[PDB]
């Protein structure tokens, strides 16, 4: 239940990111955002907390919800997945901020991470400590998450998730079969039995979905694209949810397909404040409206922004992807989009839990 709600929420956030991104390539981690927002529930109260709970569909402090999320991270990280996944969450708080009595023990209980103290007025040191934690937890893949100005003397709380995935295709592509397509673009190619389905959107737009599994039996990448190349991908991203993805998988049959997939690396950083506000959680970003009295009642607190930086590398042997989601200010500037013959949506999914570790869109220019 909790796992499924976490997914639906992160997909809604993805949809908001895609909407605000206006046809740029986007890679994004639903699990990453849900992990950090789950922590945020425990730092907030009043209407701030209620906004998050309402949007997420669950209350971290209730029933065995926090326990469910800890068991979810365990399952994702288990050796039987046959592909490395690590997820880590951290909370950095202003060192001299007086915390609510019992906060640190309770947070550790629910989340199994201890509050880390940091003096944000030592701006460069604070940035280092947090950036270093992110690097250490993404195997050095997510660098300098916090740019200059990401935090400052007024910062009181930063929550961060770091997620790392390295998967090997169940059947790799042969480098020999990779060819440049004409800017020159490397296209990988493999003919094998793949789970495949055709599908149509509510408006009768046709599209299909193929599943490229990673080794083992839990992880795969879904690739979805309209049959007609001219169709704007919003036709698909507008209708995405966990149910639709279950419907894809549930509908597939295994068949000998020629699979063409671009060899590509994508690295994006997206604002999450807009998406979170649009999804009904504006209060946390307001120094006057925010309620962080679950964390501290010494002081009015808020978070200025949130962002997530994600990198994915897809090649002949598999996929390496990393994200870090953090409540810090983004000094992101747009990157140079890459070239592709056709738009498609990809979803990296832990199928047993329906958890989406990464999803994204590659948009034809």
């Amino acid at each position: 239940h909790t796992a499924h709600q976490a997914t639906d929420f992160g997909v809604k956030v993805f949809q908001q990111v895609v909407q605000a991104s206006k046809d740029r390539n986007v890679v994004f981690s639903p699990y990453g955002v849900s992990s950090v927002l789950a922590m945020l529930q425990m730092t907030t109260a009043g209407k701030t907390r209620r906004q998050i709970q309402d949007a997420m569909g669950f209350k971290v402090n209730e029933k065995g919800t926090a326990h469910a999320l800890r068991q979810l991270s365990k399952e994702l990280m288990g050796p039987w997945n046959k592909n490395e996944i690590s997820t880590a969450d951290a909370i950095f708080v202003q060192r001299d901020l007086e915390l609510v009595q019992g906060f640190m023990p309770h947070f550790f209980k629910l989340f199994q991470t201890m509050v880390k103290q940091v003096d944000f007025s030592e701006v460069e040191r604070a940035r280092f400590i947090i950036n270093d934690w992110v690097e250490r937890h993404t195997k050095g893949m997510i660098n300098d998450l916090l740019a200059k100005g990401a935090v400052d003397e007024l910062t009181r709380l930063v929550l961060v998730n770091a997620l790392y995935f390295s998967g090997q295709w169940k059947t790799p592509f042969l480098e020999a079969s990779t060819h440049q397509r004409l800017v020159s673009v490397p296209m990988m190619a493999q003919s094998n039995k793949f789970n495949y389905t055709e599908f149509t959107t509510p408006d009768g737009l046709e599209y299909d979905v193929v599943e490229l599994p990673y080794q083992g039996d839990t992880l795969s990448m879904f690739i979805a694209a309209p049959f007609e190349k001219d169709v704007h991908l919003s036709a698909l991203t507008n209708i995405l949810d966990a149910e639709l993805i279950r419907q894809w998988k549930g509908n597939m049959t295994r068949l000998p397909r020629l699979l063409i997939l671009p060899k590509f690396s994508l690295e994006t950083e997206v604002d999450l404040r807009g998406p979170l506000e649009k999804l009904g959680m504006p209060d946390m970003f307001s120094a006057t409206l925010a309620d962080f009295t679950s964390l501290s009642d010494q002081e009015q607190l808020s978070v200025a922004q949130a962002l997530q930086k994600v990198r994915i590398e897809v090649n002949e042997s598999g996929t390496v992807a990393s994200s870090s989601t953090a409540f810090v200010i983004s000094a992101r500037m747009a990157p140079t989009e890459m070239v592709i013959d056709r738009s498609f949506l990809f979803v990296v999914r832990h199928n047993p839990t329906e958890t989406i570790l990464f999803m994204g869109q590659v948009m034809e220019p």
Side-chain angles (χ1 to χ4, degrees), residues 209-228:
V209 191
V210 64
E211 186 184 17
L212 296 60
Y214 299 96
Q215 62 183 30
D217 70 2
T218 68
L219 292 150
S220 60
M221 180 182 282
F222 297 78
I223 309 261
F227 174 68
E228 169 66 41

Side-chain angles (χ1 to χ4, degrees), residues 23 63 267 311:
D23 291 6
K63 336 283 169 185
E267 180 161 18
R311 178 167 175 83

Side-chain angles (χ1 to χ4, degrees), residues 5 9 12 50-58 279-281:
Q5 290 167 311
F9 173 68
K12 303 200 204 78
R50 185 183 324 123
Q51 294 183 338
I52 297 153
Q53 287 172 345
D54 284 348
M56 293 188 78
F58 64 85
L279 288 172
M281 300 158 275

Side-chain angles (χ1 to χ4, degrees), residues 200-205:
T200 53
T201 73
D203 300 299
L205 294 168

Side-chain angles (χ1 to χ4, degrees), residues 106-353:
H106 180 68
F107 201 84
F108 178 76
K109 174 161 61 65
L110 286 204
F111 296 106
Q112 296 290 127
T113 188
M114 281 175 291
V115 170
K116 311 166 177 303
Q117 299 189 316
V118 175
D119 176 9
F120 286 109
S121 71
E122 290 174 353
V123 175
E124 287 303 295
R125 163 127 218 179
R127 210 156 68 79
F128 172 71
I129 283 163
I130 303 178
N131 282 340
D132 169 73
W133 181 95
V134 176
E135 299 225 7
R136 280 188 288 108
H137 295 268
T138 55
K139 294 208 187 168
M141 196 164 169
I142 305 298
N143 310 112
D144 306 308
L145 186 65
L146 276 60
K148 295 193 172 200
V151 293
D152 64 22
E153 204 171 316
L154 289 185
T155 303
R156 289 297 176 266
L157 170 65
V158 173
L159 292 173
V160 183
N161 173 76
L163 178 62
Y164 174 87
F165 167 57
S166 170
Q168 276 171 290
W169 297 125
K170 186 173 225 32
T171 37
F173 295 79
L174 306 175
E175 293 180 16
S177 287
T178 297
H179 49 291
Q180 300 287 119
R181 290 300 314 286
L182 289 157
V183 164
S184 199
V185 168
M187 298 290 321
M188 305 183 302
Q190 184 191 337
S191 72
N192 255 303
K193 307 276 173 68
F194 289 101
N195 280 330
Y196 174 81
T197 191
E198 227 189 318
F199 244 87
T200 53
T201 73
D203 300 299
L205 294 168
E206 293 189 17
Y207 68 97
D208 57 16
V209 191
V210 64
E211 186 184 17
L212 296 60
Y214 299 96
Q215 62 183 30
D217 70 2
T218 68
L219 292 150
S220 60
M221 180 182 282
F222 297 78
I223 309 261
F227 174 68
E228 169 66 41
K229 130 151 163 277
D230 281 344
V231 168
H232 192 272
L233 204 62
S234 64
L236 261 41
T237 57
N238 279 353
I239 69 181
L240 271 185
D241 58 19
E243 169 63 12
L244 177 62
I245 303 175
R246 278 195 298 276
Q247 224 76 86
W248 294 348
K249 184 52 183 284
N251 251 299
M252 284 173 173
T253 59
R254 171 186 200 72
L255 294 143
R257 320 269 308 160
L258 180 59
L259 177 62
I260 301 310
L261 184 66
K263 175 174 189 186
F264 69 100
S265 285
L266 182 56
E267 180 161 18
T268 62
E269 181 176 308
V270 292
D271 169 57
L272 295 182
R273 173 174 170 158
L276 296 175
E277 289 171 336
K278 294 282 176 44
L279 288 172
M281 300 158 275
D283 279 29
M284 69 181 70
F285 305 106
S286 167
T288 47
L289 295 182
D291 191 333
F292 277 85
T293 53
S294 280
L295 176 63
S296 169
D297 63 42
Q298 164 173 43
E299 184 176 340
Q300 178 66 57
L301 306 162
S302 64
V303 289
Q305 193 181 352
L307 58 71
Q308 147 182 310
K309 188 177 195 171
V310 191
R311 178 167 175 83
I312 187 162
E313 314 182 325
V314 161
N315 60 26
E316 289 89 340
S317 63
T319 297
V320 183
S322 201
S323 60
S324 190
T325 303
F327 275 78
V328 301
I329 293 165
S330 188
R332 69 212 189 274
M333 279 177 161
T336 310
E337 300 297 299
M338 61 174 296
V339 175
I340 303 304
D341 290 357
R342 277 167 194 169
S343 305
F344 63 94
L345 168 65
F346 59 89
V347 181
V348 171
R349 186 178 190 250
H350 181 262
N351 301 305
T353 61

